[PDB]
């Protein structure tokens, strides 16, 4: 309890970002492989840095998974930010997806300037507090970020008290909406 | 000498934007139809305003280049990022491309409301500050601008000293980056 | 007229926005139904909420149309500027076009968290004066609007002096323009 | 619409087959992939091969090595082409449209072709 | 790789039958968008269902399709003389090609 030029006393406070769920998603980090972003206290989605995959095939629908309207809009919102957010993305055969009964599932290869950088840097980002602890040792020039996990799944969830890690945080979300469209190759002369 | 209210000195400084050579493209022009647009001291993009045509078929193998990853990253996103900046781009067969092993070869039909207007007006904010020798010296409407070439060409090349009119510049680069996706067209309903 | 702390008098000045149309497009309303948005003095849009449709079939051709280059580019970049900006669009069948000879028309079918949300949001926002007349007590969540109209219809006009109930404004448009492809599905994985 | 075969019957050993079928009603270049089955006397049904509007192939790759699918829009049919041809070859061959989705050919049919019908059976 | 199917498999008039298609767990993503053919004797094979219980044209609904997993099943309700014909289920793998099944011969 030192005061600063025997006037000041120095004080901390430390916010809750918990109680801004029903309007924001909140991002934070169970442990080393387990990330979560919930939105309001019912929904949200489960980022896995697995490293046995769960989807087989190379197929993705997105058309019927939208003229096929069950999923929650929200969590679409959430995906559709994360993907169109990586950064120089070509190699379309390293996702696959599977939406059949509402639900969302997609799920990244990951196996520098690769595919697994931009997904590994779109993952960091995303869930901003906390993530730091599955990057390893590979992080390399400029950023040249490596995992040894061979797959990043997605997937929804149920809300439940997870994240004992990181507190909950609005910041990664936030952040990712800004650079959504920002680094994507043209794939045909009319979009 | 010039002494402003008989104490001050006027004095001048220039900057050499050269060493960003690292961290940022950097465009150049050397006559009325070469300019350059140059990436590490390596490799970079050469845009040339011809009546000679080096593209003769209506093809633009996007998704197959995409799919054989040869090509460099960097140019890649150049391209993209000025191919992007077109403001009202309709007329796909005006654009012919060549990616074979791993170049990068892109055509434009020159020959308002015109494909060749936006064209140019894409073409003299990317390549800022040396560019207007091409104008022509006319403006039919608010930025119509019009020159006799036909044909505008951008292919790779290595580096090299080709800043004989104009000082290599990040700026025209830096500039499309924020006017990416501001000016296109809808070509489906759901995209 | 009143005078404040006796030295003061309160003035007011209205701006005339029916001068800026040589610049940038100016939208206004004239009922309940009917709304505008000009360019020039020569053509405009207008938007109509009805019962009645125009288009029953279930195409909406682009590629088409801008193969044939007859529209007006300024129309056309509006109505690609509207029908971005629109939140979660992911029924494609609740959207017709018509571009037969150069005209544009757009048809919307509005029969919350559904397509007639998102896209009455985007209309009350791009004529953001007097659209507030057609909100029919909608209001059941957080924006969630709700009209008893079933038809959104977009068509070309030419200009004439169409709005009573409130004035010119280009403030809806420049509004709509910066928060244009925020929201939007991903729809295949190589865009 | 109808598919017709044709062909001759008795090939020489290790020399070439050669068949062709041609479309009527169906256009080839309308869409679809266009490819050839194989049926040994008495054992299952074997896929060859298709061949799509764009001239891009799908081969078997037990078979890959020494077939080839040929087309042709003008005349509006597609070919058969098998090389080094064995005594394990004699069969049944039929000619079928279907429509599979290839996510290569639908990335690359899109400026000029806009976009398909979403109405994929893929059989 | 291969589908496997019974070699026959047999019923009486009336009742309701089954035959199932299975690929091996390490052919998962190979084993996609099933679809069942029926061929007659000396007869060119025709498309009886796709995707799962859809049916392209005109024959009836007695014939239903199903996908769990690994397995795949069509299920003939209301067995007739006129059924005794070769079944053939076919996948569509992540290699954008085609696998064909072994074929049940189904015997009334």
């Known amino acids: 309890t030192s005061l600063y030029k025997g006037v000041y006393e120095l004080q901390t406070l430390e916010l809750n970002m918990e109680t801004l769920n029903m309007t924001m998603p909140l991002s934070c980090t169970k442990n080393n492989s387990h990330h979560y972003i919930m939105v309001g206290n019912e929904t949200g989605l489960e980022l896995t840095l697995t490293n046995t995959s769960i989807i087989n095939h190379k197929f993705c629908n997105l058309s019927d998974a939208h003229k096929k309207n069950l999923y929650d809009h929200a969590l679409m919102s959430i995906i559709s930010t994360f993907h169109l957010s990586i950064p120089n993305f070509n190699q379309y055969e390293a996702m696959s997806c599977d939406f059949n009964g509402g639900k969302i599932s997609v799920q990244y290869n990951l196996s520098c300037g690769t595919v697994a950088n931009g997904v590994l840097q779109t993952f960091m980002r995303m869930a901003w507090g906390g993530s730091y602890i599955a990057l390893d040792s590979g992080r390399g020039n400029w950023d040249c970020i490596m995992t040894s996990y061979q797959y990043l799944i997605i997937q929804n969830t149920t809300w439940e008290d997870h994240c004992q890690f990181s507190r909950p945080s609005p910041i990664g979300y936030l952040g990712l909406l800004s650079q959504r469209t920002r680094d994507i190759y043209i794939s045909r002369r009319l979009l | 000498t010039s002494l402003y209210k008989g104490v001050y000195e006027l004095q001048t400084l220039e900057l050499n934007m050269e060493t960003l050579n690292m961290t940022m493209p950097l465009s150049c022009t050397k006559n009325n139809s070469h300019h350059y647009i140059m990436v590490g001291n390596e490799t970079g993009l050469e845009l040339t305003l011809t009546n000679t045509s080096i593209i003769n078929h209506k093809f633009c193998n996007l998704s197959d280049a995409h799919k054989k990853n040869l090509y460099d990253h960097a140019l890649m996103s150049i391209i993209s990022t000025f191919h992007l900046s077109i403001p009202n781009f309709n007329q796909y067969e005006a654009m012919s491309c060549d990616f074979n092993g791993g170049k990068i070869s892109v055509q434009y039909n020159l020959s308002c409301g015109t494909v060749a207007n936006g064209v140019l007006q894409t073409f003299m904010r990317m390549a800022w500050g040396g560019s207007y020798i091409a104008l022509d010296s006319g403006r039919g409407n608010w930025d119509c601008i019009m020159t006799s070439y036909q044909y505008l060409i951008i292919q790779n090349t290595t580096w090299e000293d080709h800043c004989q009119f104009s000082r290599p510049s990040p700026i025209g680069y830096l500039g499309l980056l924020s006017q990416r996706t501001r000016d296109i067209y809808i070509s489906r309903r759901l995209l | 007229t009143s005078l404040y702390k006796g030295v003061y008098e309160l003035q007011t000045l209205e701006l005339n926005m029916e001068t800026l149309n040589m610049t940038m497009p100016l939208s206004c309303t004239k009922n309940n139904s009917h709304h505008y948005i000009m360019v020039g003095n020569e053509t405009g849009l207008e938007l109509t909420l009805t019962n009645t449709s125009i288009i029953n079939h279930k195409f909406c051709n682009l590629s088409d149309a801008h193969k044939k280059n007859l529209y007006d580019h300024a129309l056309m970049s509006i109505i690609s500027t509207f029908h971005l900006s629109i939140p979660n669009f992911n029924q494609y069948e609740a959207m017709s076009c018509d571009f037969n000879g150069g005209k544009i028309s757009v048809q919307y079918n509005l029969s919350c968290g559904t397509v007639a949300n998102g896209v009455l949001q985007t209309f009350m926002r791009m004529a953001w004066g007097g659209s507030y007349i057609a909100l029919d007590s909608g209001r059941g969540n957080w924006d969630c609007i709700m009209t008893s109209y079933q038809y959104l219809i977009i068509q070309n006009t030419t200009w004439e002096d169409h709005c009573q109930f409130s004035r010119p404004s280009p403030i809806g448009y420049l509004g709509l323009l910066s928060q244009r492809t925020r929201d939007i599905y991903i729809s295949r994985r190589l865009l | 619409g109808t598919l017709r075969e044709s062909g001759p019957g008795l090939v020489r050993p290790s020399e070439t087959l050669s068949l062709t079928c041609g479309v009527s009603?169906?256009?080839?270049?309308?869409?679809?992939?266009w490819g050839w089955i194989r049926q040994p006397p008495g054992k299952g049904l074997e896929w060859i091969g298709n061949?799509?509007?764009?001239?891009?192939?799908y081969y078997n790759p037990s078979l890959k090595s020494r077939v080839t699918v040929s087309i042709d829009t003008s005349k509006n049919q597609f070919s058969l082409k098998l090389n080094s041809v064995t005594a394990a070859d004699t069969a049944v061959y039929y000619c079928?449209?279907?429509?599979?989705?290839?996510?290569?050919?639908?990335?690359?049919?899109?400026?000029?072709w806009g976009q398909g019908t979403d109405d994929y059976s893929y059989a | 790789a291969v589908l496997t199917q019974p070699a026959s498999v047999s019923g009486s008039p009336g009742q309701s039958i089954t035959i199932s298609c299975t690929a091996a767990?390490?052919?998962?993503?190979?084993?996609?968008?099933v679809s069942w053919y029926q061929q007659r004797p000396d007869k060119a094979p025709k498309l009886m269902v796709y995707?799962?219980?859809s049916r392209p044209s005109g024959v009836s609904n007695r014939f239903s399709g199903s996908k769990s997993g690994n397995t795949a099943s069509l299920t003939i309700s209301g067995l007739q003389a006129e059924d005794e014909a070769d079944y053939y289920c076919?996948?569509?793998?992540?290699?954008?090609?085609?696998?064909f099944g072994t074929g049940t011969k189904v015997t009334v």
């Open positions: 061949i799509y509007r764009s001239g891009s192939t």
């Open positions: 009603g169906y256009s080839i270049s309308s869409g679809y992939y």
């Open positions: 767990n390490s052919d998962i993503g190979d084993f996609a968008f």
């Open positions: 995707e799962v219980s």
């Open positions: 079928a449209r279907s429509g599979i989705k290839v996510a290569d050919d639908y990335y690359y049919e899109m400026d000029v």
């Open positions: 076919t996948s569509y793998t992540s290699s954008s090609t085609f696998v």
